[PDB]
Amino acid sequence: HHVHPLPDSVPESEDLFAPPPRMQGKEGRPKPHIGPNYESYVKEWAKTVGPNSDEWWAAKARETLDWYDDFKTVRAGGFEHGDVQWFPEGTLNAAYNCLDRHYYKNPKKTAIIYEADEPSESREVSYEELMQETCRVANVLKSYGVKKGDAVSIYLPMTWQAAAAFLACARIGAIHSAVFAGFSAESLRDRVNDCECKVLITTDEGRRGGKTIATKQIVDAALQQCPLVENVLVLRRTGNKVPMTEGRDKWWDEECAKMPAYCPCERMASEDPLFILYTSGKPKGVVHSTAGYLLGTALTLKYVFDAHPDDRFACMADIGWITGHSYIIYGPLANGITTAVFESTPVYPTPSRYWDFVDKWKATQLYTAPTAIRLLRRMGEDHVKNHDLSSLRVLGSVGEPINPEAWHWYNDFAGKNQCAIVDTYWMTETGSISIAPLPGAISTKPGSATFPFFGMDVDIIDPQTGQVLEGNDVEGVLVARRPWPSIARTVYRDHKRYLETYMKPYPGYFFFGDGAARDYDGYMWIKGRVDDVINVSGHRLSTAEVESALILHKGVAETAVVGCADDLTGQAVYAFVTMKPEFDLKATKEADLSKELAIQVRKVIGPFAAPKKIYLVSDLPKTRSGKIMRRVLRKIVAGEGIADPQIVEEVKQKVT
Amino acid sequence: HHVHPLPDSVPESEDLFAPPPRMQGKEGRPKPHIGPNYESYVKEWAKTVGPNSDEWWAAKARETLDWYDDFKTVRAGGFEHGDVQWFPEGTLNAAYNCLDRHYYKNPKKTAIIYEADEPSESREVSYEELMQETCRVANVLKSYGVKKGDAVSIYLPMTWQAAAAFLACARIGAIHSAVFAGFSAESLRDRVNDCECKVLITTDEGRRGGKTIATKQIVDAALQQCPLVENVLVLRRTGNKVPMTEGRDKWWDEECAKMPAYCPCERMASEDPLFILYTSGKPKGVVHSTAGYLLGTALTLKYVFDAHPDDRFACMADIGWITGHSYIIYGPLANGITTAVFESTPVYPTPSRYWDFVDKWKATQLYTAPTAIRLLRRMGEDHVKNHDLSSLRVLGSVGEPINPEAWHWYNDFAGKNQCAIVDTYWMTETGSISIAPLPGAISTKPGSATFPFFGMDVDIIDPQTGQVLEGNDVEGVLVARRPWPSIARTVYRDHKRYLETYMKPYPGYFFFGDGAARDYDGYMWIKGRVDDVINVSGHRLSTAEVESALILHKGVAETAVVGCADDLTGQAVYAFVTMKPEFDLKATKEADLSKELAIQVRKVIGPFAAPKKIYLVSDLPKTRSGKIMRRVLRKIVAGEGDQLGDLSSIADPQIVEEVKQKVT
Amino acid sequence: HHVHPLPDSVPESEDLFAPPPRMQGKEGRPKPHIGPNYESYVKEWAKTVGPNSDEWWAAKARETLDWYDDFKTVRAGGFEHGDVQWFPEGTLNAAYNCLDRHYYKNPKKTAIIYEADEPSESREVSYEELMQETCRVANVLKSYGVKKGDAVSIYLPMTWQAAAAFLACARIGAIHSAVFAGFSAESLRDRVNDCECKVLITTDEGRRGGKTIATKQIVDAALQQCPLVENVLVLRRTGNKVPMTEGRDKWWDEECAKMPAYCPCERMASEDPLFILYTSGKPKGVVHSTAGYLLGTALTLKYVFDAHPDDRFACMADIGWITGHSYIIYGPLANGITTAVFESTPVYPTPSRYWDFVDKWKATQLYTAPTAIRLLRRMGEDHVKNHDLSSLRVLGSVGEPINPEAWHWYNDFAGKNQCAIVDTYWMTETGSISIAPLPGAISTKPGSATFPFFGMDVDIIDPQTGQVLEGNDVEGVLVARRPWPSIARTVYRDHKRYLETYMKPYPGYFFFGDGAARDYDGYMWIKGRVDDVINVSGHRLSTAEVESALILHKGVAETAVVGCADDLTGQAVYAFVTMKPEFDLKATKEADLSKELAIQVRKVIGPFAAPKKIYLVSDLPKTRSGKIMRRVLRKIVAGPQIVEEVKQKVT
């Protein structure tokens, strides 16, 4: 076979992990909605794609959501000009489907488990409390003149009120634009100005990992260049002395005390914009409609994680990420279950924090990024070994390919080999999970996204010819043939960039921008960004298979390989390797470590995949979501031309 | 028994007035919807409360109102945090339920009987005319940029166009804030600024009691401190020269002439705010939603007054009062009947005006306040005795406890002992009538509100312990157990004050602020405000029983007793008595009359209730709705005159100076 | 008989044209919705009028349109106070019924045949393309802050994007106010200021008949006196170097490139205003609601022209005219057929342009004005004789009474005596066609509108007594007894003028302002405006019969007769006659020609109708819609370059 699984230390015959007993309906656990085998997944999946799927999507839309006005058409439009339409005639409100309809049925059921930065301050927020807080904020926004269609910037840390600020905007038909708390004043400025918002919601200070986020300090600097912002709502999170501008700035609690605890729901057309979300050139504000996005997040959350009514979904991401949008707030609350708002880091107070949380609340699912798993892997298994963690049934990975080493560490310790691992592939532009194994039906492989989700008709294209590589054992670029409900509708006031980025390069398709491969079993392998691909002497090297090989060597915590122009091979491979903090870098020779890694790569991939130069760095350039910034490293090693900015100075200094 | 009826001259066994013949389906009168006995009221009432009442309330809302979008949930929310919800998902429009759907069935039926200040200028306003006037005003407001959710101030006298200005706001989804015509410039300013309205509706002048109300003069003075008001629509009521500011002020007739006579109805969510109404500390803007309030006003009117399609309802109150909101405009027009807009006073041209009106239009119900009833008692029965008044079937009282003396004068002369008397207890914050006898089912008692209305689950609480006084013959503070559709939703931009006033003092309940008593027959007695109670040597005195005792003495027209701290008795009783203007002044010594009143109180209540000092004054401090301002007298008779409020919009503000001068 | 047909050279017994074979269901043509005789038209019409007609109107509204929310009441209000209501409770969107529901059914079906000024640049615009363009413009408007109820001025030539600009406004609930491209800056200014619009849509330049319309040049002059206009969207139609005002003016293509190709449809109540249209004293902004107007245009287009799904409707009018509003955009697109946007004149490149167009696209109906018919009649029959034109089934005339001479030229050459001729009478204030023959059921007469459309119960009133002239063979002023769905709802911010013009003069009726006559056959004859009537010695002379008489004399191309105060006859007749440019007036003495025309009128009408003085002019004062401006001539004999010529001759 030509397409090979990501390098792993386990033999392939022992590397097929079928759904465990917890995902089989045993141990008193809920039977999965999809099961018990791969055919059972395809039987349902094939109903959701092709030109005969309209009846299926219409039925699901009416089952999943509560509509004020029914729709007549199911789908319309296409990629060509960016006129995607789903359920155009229907009306609904997101805050109603995420709050009201569950409050009316069981008001005391916990909507949010608020895990505070300090574990002792954690508490449960019922649907009643969240609904009342949401309605108060909505009335405050109306009193500020916020109208349906106006943009509202949210600059909030991971306190539970962030969901109230999200859903308050959705309740009145406003368009919220959430920005990671802790972004620089310049980054926040650009996103406030691009959405042309007149109202901004923030805190006095944020608390993550025992560190203070000077939110109001940053907002003041940014708004010195944001003339359109007239009202700033400041949530009193810490109570520390922070500057306040009289007239413009008002306290969250004081404003909400003047407002009623109920607010009517604005009846939104399906294609009314629900939110703007800028991704970390110019800031790209991905715009999502209402009904399609909500339906997508609801069904993926229900099917990709096998959600059941009493479950407690624990997504540890930040709401500044689409993962937080879709699988902390909208997805979980749409289905009417409990969701987790994690305010701290995975290592505060100690690297046992994740597992202290899981056993404290009896979390039934855990959702996080590969970068977090690698962080916990390099801290020691003592922090996980002595935990129960039996409430869990599904563990999810999102943001990047998951190295088989991290995959196993996730599977072995967090799941105790009794949880299904769902490597969920998707994008901010996809709205909901696009490719992931259904935990109760699909047998997994370390690092494989497996098979596409409902409504996702994906294929592999030759990047040069542009034609479909039919069959298995093929490698190329991933594309989608048909629109899906939760697909992004535009880029805010830059629809030209929306079409040129995803619709022009391969006409007739959606262009994810990812290299993909379909091995001989039909499993989809998403091996990294197309821009990250390295072509050594006519050999397409993907960063996932190379980095997966490097982590197989003892002591390695994280790696990142980029491409640079080479005299002989056209393009050569350069590697950045982060060793575990408890490595004896003095005992193992630096040059010897490079040779050991080089031979390691040669053994599992091929002679061509060996790095030509290796760089030792304390950490890698990373976004706030956890993605490795390979483009940044690539330009640095080329001479032409976000979590910890100090890594940039270290990388360029080590370049010489 | 411990709980005793309000002082009356009739024994209790001869003081129970069963439903009269007119309310029995006889004398060619419509058979009541509820009857014939008390059991028939309980059988239906029990469907409206308890955990099985959604089935009843859902049916009534859908049968009573026309909805643009149906609702899914019946009720939700509660008192605790002030998130009351009724029919959340439904959409509707008030102006549609009060105008359009009746215009479509019989456009020529009289919607408003306009009783002008001068009787000769009275005329009938059909539903067609009222709808066209409303749609024109709505289009004028739309042309001013008024959007759904915007506030509009109404400063209009009791001319028939006032209903058009109300329903025009409701038609476009705006929130009208009506202020009594004649309020001082300072009082109007504060209410115009508090609702943050940008448009003001007013007249050039108002006409009541043959005197000119310089409305536009007052509006001009107030608007120098109301910067948010950009457009003022002036109704030409008298036509006298009044200042007009070009651009800001434009004439009603001219503006409406540029607009079509139909306007689309904004589809309002059930919980969208319908109106703000400031009640006479800081101005308290009581906010009401749409569907709950509309349903409440409609059902109370249909059941408390036994409304039938052809009836002609005559509420003489002013639209600046919640009684006018609910039982002049919204209540009556929703039910599709005729309602009265009375522009004059009860004594202009003469104290026979009320009864001339009833016999001219053949009014079938009359609704007014005790202050007006006592006033007519004090003018002479020659002005009422020689009237027919046989069209009437139900007489209503609202605003304060009804004195057994006034109740009888109401029953004897206005009704000729052939009308059922409905003592309707409620508040601006309740939206619709809370406690009242159903005329065709309940036998009344002088001064008793009798039994609570549908959807009202009320109880008696000990004000200290906070526990329910179960059973009969109990006395305490009135509370409600469950929300009711028409309950106020908030105080405009002061939801904290809303919760602290009605929801915090007795958590889990609504606190009316009224002392109440449930006698041994189950009848409820609302004996006055809790703030007005006087505790003489640990004995709780309610202002109703004391003033009812005083009114039992011949010659008494009106009284008002307040409390003052006493060294020995803790609190002592002080009385303010307004005797008829033609009493034996100078002939009967002031000191001689004071002793007679004190002994009368000692004879019917007890020695502790005897006033220690009595003050004779020409009138009492009163609001424009007719409530006696006992807080003013209490603070004045306690040396707190410097700490009084904005007593400028009082019915007669000069009476305040008389009380403080009469300090000794 | 007292009521006589308009002067024609054909005998009356040879002047009744029954539905031709193409309109009878033969030759592979669709069965007409109404047929085959007059009784079939009356049988259906009686359901649409009277106090039991709600059942019919409810069914049509629900079958014809797609509603977001259903209605309960059918009709309400009346003429008295101007509170007409139709389907008050229902919601819908015009852009949805004209674009979305057809895009969802067949996106590639051609919505607009765009006939460019140069024939070689013509192309088909599919429903998909038109919908995408509309949604982009709608999103551009929303980004400008345009809200439901805001007015938007449209100053666009006859390029296909004009429909996109119309429907974009309708999509978001805005009220579009279209103004003829080429109107002076003063006329544009007055109409822009009266609607208080915040946004204006125009082109850099327009092209009609090979000439440049400096649209943006005119806009600049007008906006120097239009304070409320903040944003101007300029469509690059020609691309010529034109001034642009930074900030205020932005390009259509550039703005639309920033927007998605879909936009949600605003859910409009039936009586929400759809558009303002000023008619060419002070400018009169006629306002139309949504559901009534849309339903009216749909049914008249379906029945007056016997529209069928695959038909290709060719209305050559301009969208600045109500004919363009109702029977270029709304009518056809609502019914989901193909419509024509004709950008040129009927004589560019040659007077065969109309007929070259018909055979190129195989148009199934043609709709135009008498002013266009008369122009081509005087250009030579060689340009029409040698064309196929067999795709046509119905030819329509609109704007003014159709002279029997032009009527025959229409039927003889353009129709080849195989098309039904529909003389459609209505006004901007009626919304849709009021009186017209149903082509598959009614036998026509040259110059007669025949019978009123469904829902139109019209009558004749004696202009003096004010009483109804019941029966046939009656002549007077035309009025309507009951409101009809598409009736105009008001005049923008002048409901007083609206009531005084149409509702006050004859209370209880709608006053069209036209002299009318109902002959012994029940046929209705619209003989001209009441203001144009001439009372010679107590004889009511209508301009149609007098001008029809003048056109019966050979060499006459167009005429216009006005009234004059006379000492003896009370009112005297003055005639303005336009002879063909290739007439040798130098050979024929002026006085000789006048006597021949004067006697001609004496022969066909009577001695009293003879003009007292006849004036020879190259052309007549005309609007852009084609109506003859008789008021101009009337005051001229008392105390666009044609005005200078007319005043000099009478001296």
Ligand SMILES: Nc1ncnc2c1ncn2[C@@H]1O[C@H](COP(=O)(O)OC2CC2)[C@@H](O)[C@H]1O
């Ligand atoms: N399961 C996965 N396997 C391999 N690669 C993955 C996977 N999930 C994400 N990615 C990478 O992250 C981008 C998305 O990031 P984004 O923040 O836009 O959306 C985030 C996902 C919510 C993908 O385009 C790709 O490059």
Ligand SMILES: Nc1ncnc2c1ncn2[C@@H]1O[C@H](COP(=O)(O)OC2CC2)[C@@H](O)[C@H]1O
């Ligand atoms: N039948 C009654 N018996 C005894 N007291 C009554 C009665 N009606 C009103 N009140 C007093 O008036 C306040 C409300 O006045 P408001 O103007 O807000 O509402 C007015 C009533 C529409 C009550 O709280 C109470 O103190």
